[PDB]
Design brief:
21% of the residues lie in helices and 29% in strands. The protein has 1015 residues and is of the alpha+beta class. The chain has five domains: 1-381, Glycoside hydrolase 38, N terminal domain (7-stranded beta/alpha barrel, Alpha-Beta Barrel); 382-492, Substrate Binding Domain Of Dnak, Chain:A, Domain 2; 493-617 and 898-919, Immunoglobulin-like; 618-897, Distorted Sandwich (Beta-galactosidase, Chain A, domain 5), CATH 2.70.98.30; 920-1015, Immunoglobulin-like. Helix 5 (145-163) packs across helix 13 (424-438). The radius of gyration is 30 Å and the shape is globular. The protein starts with 12 loop residues before the first strand and ends with a strand. The relative contact order is 0.11. The structure holds 2-acetamido-2-deoxy-beta-D-glucopyranose (NAG), (1R,2R,3S,4R,5R)-5-aminocyclopentane-1,2,3,4-tetrol and zinc ion. The site of zinc ion has 4 residues, from loops. Zinc ion is lined by residues 60, 62, 174, 441. Its cofactor is Zn(2+).
């Protein structure tokens, strides 16, 4: 295995180093506003060295943005595809590329057989070429790598089945900045080339000056370079026709033949396109070839890529004709006039890359190596696109919930083959497709119109229900005696109980387990653990009595704690935010111990009085002028007091101290150690009253954040043996710190209400001497070093926080893990901050045509890990990566892949079993089974199950590795006949494995295996 910590890769371009050196001056470069006046030697090309130009027609089709997926399909995309089919059929030299398989699959399945065959033909013959082949063109900032892979797999599996093709070139012209997670996944999925566009204008200038726009993009830790993927960065401001022919959009716009008037389009530079004729073609060709030759100066080979398209282009037949006929005339003239030394033609993306690599092999060019990322994007001036790291945070959180549900449903149901009547494959396909759709760069990003966000939400809700159905059918099958099992595939044997989605104070949707002597004495509950190691975790359920005790299925008592059910209310009479306790339901909490990739059953039983193994939390309400808080049968009376500082410790874990406002002020790791200052604070950013306004995309603050005025908030302290918490009702946020004996959990119920033009930030203030350095993750896959740059505006120093961030000095690290992607930064030494929600009255001039005024309450979840790191083996100061400790990684897993909880629906579960998976190997802590998916339906004689294995890299800090078992995924199901290593999409076999054993992967590596079973 490559060492990902101790060897700093030697690359030609390292983006953090580049950023440190660059001046980022925004000067007027002339017609190329963000560049310079490009000059070329006309003698560079001649009969023996011609410029080869590939004009690549395309149409950018957003799966939801200003209209829903279905609205766009009906109004635009179905016509684009139908007319592409006709025009490509009729014009054999015409070409077209297509990216979004969600639309293509929608279209294809509605075609008659004759048309399906015609479509297959234009694909087989290379006229229509799929690029990337994902369900969508995903966001790269907020998306989790597991869902980037999911959507890629969904689109490519469809393409392989119906089109018999698997793209090896990726096209990402629109995500708002670019992540190295993409080449990581693509290179492990058979790709050879990728194209990107939305990178900071200063980066395009810098790389263009050095002809470093094409590069071998490797991972930041990759010393050897095996992760490298050839990448083409487009050089100009947009992918539209005015910004793709060459540096001068006033000239290039004249070659967008849709802009002459009848289509309702024009050229903002005031010179319209002109129909190409024999009398003007020489002049028109001389203008166009000059643009091409200027663009070609920015690249190393004699092969030039000219995209020809824009949003929802190539709809009408008249549009196909106007572009095709005019370009054909230009090509005939240019290619016949030796003096140009150009050969121009319609091409596809693969054709471009093939020709570039032919030139490379001919010794014509050598390409630079590059590592790093391309955040945070700015398209112009100080307009940094860091707002979408937070926009519509309810749905960003929902994404992570559904991510987990999809994994759990696919894994739970993979253990068996299912009858078609069970509709398992149908429900899983629906859930995968809706989650995949949301990865779109206007879905998870929060940059779509309100009604489109509602569509995505409704789709995701249906997907959650689909996952629940599959999960609960699976649990019932896995834990019922086989000769008793008698499934009704429409029936709900269990309901899922989720304590953190939509969340307390968001939706009152959790079911109470109703027990009573005259109704039902006891209830079975089941926990699932999707991770491949034994896990203990506190779990909680609502019950109708405080007198409840827990047993395992060997009837062993389990220690439990009962607490009240507290809900916070904005009292519009008293103008306070305060908690109310239920007098009819209670929370019971206990530790569940669950096998790797397994299930464990427990029983909740009512009694008439306090059970031996159940304890009761105390509750203390801190506020002046208190009033009573009755709690029904709950056996401990609520206590009252004036606001005061408090301190809490659960088990042998950290001691946390809180301000009189209920906010953390210090953490003491052990009995002897210092009380380390760690202060939570809430602040607000506003919007500028002159110049550019923040909106869904852009964060344009009117200066540093100002503290939220807290008043005298009400603080609730619950103290228990197993779990304690401090909760406070702040303006716009019910903030909770929960302690279970290890790193605390933070929950924020964020309701920005009607606070217009406000962004609420949560900041941590510490003494850690972090300087200008901090670390943020990329897609939940890797941590990248960031350097705060005071030469850039505040909004440029904001980065995506898709799963965590940390600061550290020689001795101390503070890591904040997240259960939802949000934007954040470290704006001063010792600080971390993460945005909670933003409500913006104005549009930000990127075409969305609305502000962000559709906020809804969201429950954000976090873990906060303070650690000593002086003994850890860390990368050198020059290394661009950072790595989590074991505790921080486990804390992240606790947020993203918690135990699933099931409540048996009926009164009695006949044939119930106590456990599943007790014999499953408990793998080393850094290894995950990211995906387990049965790939075959029940009628296949050879069943196949696919696994994606990911090994992270955890810091060595002197905690001896304990004995763990080797995980061989190929032997998880019986009767294995074959084990193959595959691409991550499972679509290509790469290696037939000796002894049918799937080897574990190296740190930072991801591998896929398929096991075949003869049953
Ligand atoms: C799928 O593509 C391959 C190209 O190598 C071809 O051999 C195979 O016959 C194709 N399958 C079809 C056309 O059904
Ligand atoms: N190019 C446009 C982007 O700026 C929008 O967010 C939509 O994705 C649209 O495609
Ligand atoms: Zn788009």
């Amino acid at each position: 295995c490559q060492d990902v910590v101790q060897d700093v890769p030697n690359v030609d371009v390292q983006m953090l180093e580049l950023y440190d050196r660059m001046s980022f001056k925004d000067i007027d470069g002339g017609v190329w506003k963000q560049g310079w006046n490009i000059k070329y030697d006309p003698l560079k090309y001649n009969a023996h060295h011609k410029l080869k130009v590939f004009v690549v027609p395309h149409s950018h089709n957003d799966p939801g943005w200003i209209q829903t997926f279905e609205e766009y399909y009906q109004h635009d995309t179905k016509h684009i595809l139908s007319n592409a089919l006709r025009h490509l059929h009729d014009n054999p030299e015409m070409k077209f590329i297509w990216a979004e398989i969600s639309y293509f699959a929608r279209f294809y399945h509605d075609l008659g057989e004759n048309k399906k065959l015609q479509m297959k033909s234009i694909v087989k013959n290379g006229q229509l070429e799929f690029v990337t082949g994902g369900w969508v063109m995903p966001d790269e900032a907020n998306s989790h790598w597991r869902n980037v892979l999911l959507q890629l797999t969904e689109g490519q599996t469809w393409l392989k089945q119906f089109m018999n093709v698997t793209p090896t070139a990726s096209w990402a012209i629109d995500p708002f900045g670019h992540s190295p997670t993409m080449p990581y996944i693509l290179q492990k999925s058979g790709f050879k080339n990728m194209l990107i566009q939305r990178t900071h204008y200063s980066v395009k200038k810098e790389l263009a000056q050095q002809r470093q726009l094409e590069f071998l993009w490797r991972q930041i830790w990759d010393n050897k370079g095996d992760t490298a993927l050839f990448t083409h960065m487009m050089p100009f401001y947009s992918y539209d026709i005015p910004h793709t022919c060459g540096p001068d959009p006033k000239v290039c716009c004249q070659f967008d033949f849709k802009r002459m008037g009848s289509f309702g389009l024009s050229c903002p530079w005031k010179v319209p396109p002109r129909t190409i004729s024999d009398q003007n073609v020489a002049a028109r060709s001389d203008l166009l070839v000059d643009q091409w030759k200027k663009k070609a100066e920015l690249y190393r080979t004699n092969v030039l890529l000219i995209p020809l398209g824009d949003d929802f282009r190539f709809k009408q037949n008249t549009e196909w004709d106007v572009q095709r006929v005019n370009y054909e005339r230009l090509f005939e003239h240019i290619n016949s006039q030796a003096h140009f030394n150009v050969q121009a033609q319609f091409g596809t993306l693969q054709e471009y890359f093939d020709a570039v690599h032919q030139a490379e092999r001919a010794g014509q060019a050598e390409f630079p190596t590059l590592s790093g990322d391309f955040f945070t994007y700015a398209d112009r001036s100080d307009n940094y696109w860091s707002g979408y790291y937070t926009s519509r945070p309810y749905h960003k959180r929902m994404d992570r919930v559904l991510m987990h549900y999809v994994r759990a449903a696919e894994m739970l149901s993979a253990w068996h083959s299912w009858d078609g009547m069970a509709r398992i494959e149908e429900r899983l396909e629906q859930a995968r497709r809706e989650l995949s759709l949301f990865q779109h760069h206007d879905g998870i990003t929060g940059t779509a119109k309100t009604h489109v966000v509602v569509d995505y939400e409704q789709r995701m809700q249906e997907a959650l229900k689909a996952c629940q159905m599959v999960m609960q059918q699976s649990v019932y099958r896995l834990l019922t005696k086989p000769s008793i099992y008698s499934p009704d595939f429409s029936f709900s044997y269990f309901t899922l109980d989720d304590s953190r989605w939509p969340g307390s104070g968001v939706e009152d949707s959790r079911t109470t387990i109703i027990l009573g002597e005259d109704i039902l004495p006891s209830k079975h509950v089941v926990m699932h653990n999707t991770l491949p190691h034994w896990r203990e975790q506190l779990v909680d359920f609502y019950v109708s009595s405080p007198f409840v005790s827990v047993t395992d299925l060997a009837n062993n008592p389990v220690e439990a704690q009962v607490s009240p059910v507290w809900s916070w209310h904005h009292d519009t009479l008293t103008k306070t935010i305060h908690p109310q306790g239920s007098t009819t339901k209670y929370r019971i909490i206990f530790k569940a111990r669950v096998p790797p990739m397994g299930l464990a059953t427990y029983v909740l039983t009512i009694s008439d009085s306090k059970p031996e193994h159940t304890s009761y939390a105390s509750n203390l309400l801190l506020r002046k002028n208190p009033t009573s808080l009755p709690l029904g049968q709950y056996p401990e009376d609520v206590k009252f007091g004036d606001p005061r500082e408090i301190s809490l410790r659960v088990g042998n874990g950290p001691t946390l101290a809180f301000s009189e406002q209920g906010l953390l002020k210090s953490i003491q790791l052990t009995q002897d150690s210092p009380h380390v200052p760690v202060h939570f604070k809430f602040l607000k950013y506003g919007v500028r009253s002159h110049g550019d306004r923040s909106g869904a995309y852009l964060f344009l603050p009117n200066g540093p954040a100002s503290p939220v005025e807290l008043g005298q908030p009400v603080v609730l302290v619950t103290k228990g043996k197993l779990e304690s918490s401090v909760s406070v009702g702040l303006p716009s946020v019910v903030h909770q710190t929960i302690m279970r004996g290890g790193a605390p959990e933070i929950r924020n119920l964020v309701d920005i209400g009607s606070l217009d033009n406000t962004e609420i930030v949560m900041r941590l203030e510490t003494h850690i001497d972090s300087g200008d350095i901090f670390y943020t993750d990329l897609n939940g896959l890797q941590f990248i070093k960031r350097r705060r740059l005071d030469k850039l505006p505040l909004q440029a120093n904001y980065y995506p926080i898709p799963s965590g961030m940390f600061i550290e000095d020689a001795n101390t690290r503070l890591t904040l893990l997240t259960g939802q992607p949000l934007g954040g930064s470290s704006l001063a030494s010792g600080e971390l901050e993460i945005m909670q929600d933003r409500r913006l009255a104005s549009d930000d001039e990127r075409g969305l045509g609305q502000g962000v005024l559709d906020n809804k309450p969201v429950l954000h979840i976090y873990r906060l890990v303070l650690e000593k790191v002086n003994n850890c083996v860390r990368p050198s100061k020059l290394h661009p990566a950072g790595y989590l400790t074991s505790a921080a990684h486990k804390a992240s897993q606790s947020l993203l892949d918690p135990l699933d909880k099931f409540i048996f629906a009926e009164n009695e579960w006949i044939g119930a079993q106590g456990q599943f998976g007790g014999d499953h190997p408990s793998a080393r802590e850094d290894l995950d089974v990211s995906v387990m998916r049965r790939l075959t339906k029940s009628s296949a004689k050879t069943q196949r199950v696919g696994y994606v294995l990911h090994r992270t890299n955890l810091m060595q800090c002197g905690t001896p590795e304990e004995h763990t078992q080797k995980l061989d995924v190929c032997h998880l199901l019986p009767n294995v006949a074959r084990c193959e290593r595959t691409t991550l999409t499972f679509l290509q076999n790469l290696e037939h494995l000796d002894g049918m054993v799937a080897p574990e992967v190296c740190p930072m590596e991801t591998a896929a295996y398929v096991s075949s079973h003869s049953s």
